[PDB]
Copies of this chain bind each other. A is one copy, B any other.
């Protein structure tokens, strides 16, 4: 379910080596995080210039005219309940995105959080501690907000 929506939508970044970070093509923009560095694959998609956002920790650019349906949809109308993720399920409890145990790990940042009907809700950056929660989300009016729990080291 989550695999089909996210297939060829999560182009990896190489640290001149192993998998370092993951980038999202959504809303016509390519968002990748600053805390991962290196080279993204699919060099057709890598030719765009990037503008940094330090307070939001994201480099954004523009899709080079192959958007069509390859760009995902984001939605700030998020209900409190279940969400999906490549590593499983995400529970939303009063502005908090929670996953259990230690399923989040280093190099797994940048994975989009989708929902039922398949629209982007959030993009992960990191988290802290029986549960695990720093993630960038969208406010009620549709404004970029960074919800970072205390002591959330980045992956």
Contacts and interface: CB of A to CB of B under 8 A. Distances in A.
Q: Which of A14, A17, A131, A151 has the most B CB atoms < 10 Å from its CB?
A: A17
Interface residues of A, number: 25
A67 B149 contact: yes
Contacts of A151: 67
Interface of A: 14, 16-18, 43-45, 47, 64-68, 71, 73, 93-94, 96, 98, 128, 131, 133, 149-151
Q: In the assembly, how many copies of this chain are there?
A: 4
A68 B133 contact: yes
Contact of A17 (B17, B64, B94): B64
A65 to B, nearest CB: 6
Contact of A16 (B47, B96, B128, B150): B47
